[PDB]
């Protein structure tokens, strides 16, 4: 069935707890398969270490460039960056789980998990996925986030993977 995966996050390196997150692997198999992998690290990279380095409250808590730590990095499984491979699934309210991006066809490794509605978004970002538990670590996360995106904690990935 579709993937479940796990993120476990502290902020200063004191547990918030684990995020589990169901990948739409029946409505976007490759980016589905993209996270799936990039949570094992099971080609050798992945998200593993790296941070929540953009947590805006009330939009979106994004994470995913395990290269250069700052949003300008990350890679697919695929390669540098992989297509938008459909915007069937929308922003529909918290929890929904979406592709960064820099322009059309240009998702790496870059996501984000929604804290509000999104649907502005919707058509530029594919979803891919949504929280099946956690959402209140979630919230803790956001807590930590500002309007420019800056955090007031180091929030890190310290572990990752697939639970099925």
Same mark, same amino acid.
């Given at each position: 069935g579709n993937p479940l995966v796990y993120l476990d996050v502290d902020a200063n390196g004191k547990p918030l707890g684990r995020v589990v997150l169901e990948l739409k692997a029946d409505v976007v198999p490759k980016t589905a398969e993209?996270? @799936?992998?990039? +949570?094992?690290?099971? %080609?050798?990279?992945?998200? %593993?270490?790296?941070?929540? /380095? @953009?947590?805006?409250?009330?939009?979106? +808590?994004?994470?995913?460039?395990?290269?250069? /730590?700052?949003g300008t990095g990350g890679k697919s499984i695929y390669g540098s960056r992989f297509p938008d491979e459909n915007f069937t699934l929308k922003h529909v309210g918290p929890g929904v789980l979406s592709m960064a991006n820099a322009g059309p066809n240009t998702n790496g490794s870059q996501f984000f998990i929604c804290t509000i509605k999104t649907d502005w978004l919707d058509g530029k970002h594919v979803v891919f996925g949504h929280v099946i538990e956690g959402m209140d670590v979630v919230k803790k996360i956001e807590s930590f986030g500002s309007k420019s995106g800056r955090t007031s904690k180091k929030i890190v990935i310290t572990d990752c993977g697939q639970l099925s």
């Open positions: 993209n996270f @799936r992998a990039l +949570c094992t690290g099971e %080609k050798g990279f992945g998200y %593993k270490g790296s941070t929540f /380095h @953009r947590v805006i409250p009330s939009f979106m +808590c994004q994470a995913g460039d395990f290269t250069n /730590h700052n």
